[PDB]
Every structure is written in C-alpha cells, then in structure tokens.
Amino acid sequence: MALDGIRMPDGCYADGTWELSVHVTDLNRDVTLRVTGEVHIGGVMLKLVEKLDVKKDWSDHALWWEKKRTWLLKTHWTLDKYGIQADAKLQFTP
C-alpha cells in the first residue's frame, strides 16, 4: 500500500526498489543494481554480469559484504533475511 507505518516517499518510494551499490574490486568501479529485499544473491551476480556481456571473468564473480567480510554465497536467503539494503555497499569480486 503506502502507509506501512510511515507515509509514501519512504512508505512507498514507488515499488520498494533500492539499488544495491557494488564496488567492483577487479575493476575498481562502482555499479548499482536496481533490486528489492527479495532478490537472491545469485540473482545479483546474474544481472551485474548481464550488463557486462563478455567472456570476462564470470566464474571469478561473487558478492562479499565487507561490513561482514563474508562471501555472499547464501542463494537460499535474501537481502532482507540477512538485513542487507542500500546502506550496505557490496563488492563484485571472486
């Protein structure tokens, strides 16, 4: 709806889409993927690569959470599950 307990700019935004930041360490760039708190990690590496479109290092691709120094390989859980969001900047490296 919109209420959600807040209002709309924050109680809606438009659809609850927040692009997750991705600091590519293998490129040193920073990309953002328009996602929601329901996309599986394996869902992010897919899109980010889709934008690439090249026989580049695709297997050497995996997201890590420096706020946790982890390796986001839990395709079962999601962002919300762990608590990730736009305030969480991930990276795209092996």
Partner 1 sequence: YHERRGSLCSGCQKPITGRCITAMAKKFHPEHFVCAFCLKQLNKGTFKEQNDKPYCQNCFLKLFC
Chain residues in the site for partner 1 (CB under 8 A): 40, 42-43, 45-46, 55, 58-59, 75-76
Closest CB to partner 1 among 7 and 34?
Answer: 34
> What does the angle CA 46 – CA 53 – CA 80 come to, to the nearest 5 degrees?
20
Q: Could you give the CA distance from residue 74 to residue 42 in angstroms, rounded to a whole number? A: 8
| Residue 81: strand, helix, or coil | helix
Q: Could you give the CA distance from residue 56 to residue 69 in angstroms, rounded to a whole number? A: 24
Minimum distance from residue 59 beta carbon to partner 1 (Å): 4
Closest CB to partner 1 among 23 and 40?
Answer: 40
Minimum distance from residue 45 beta carbon to partner 1 (Å): 7
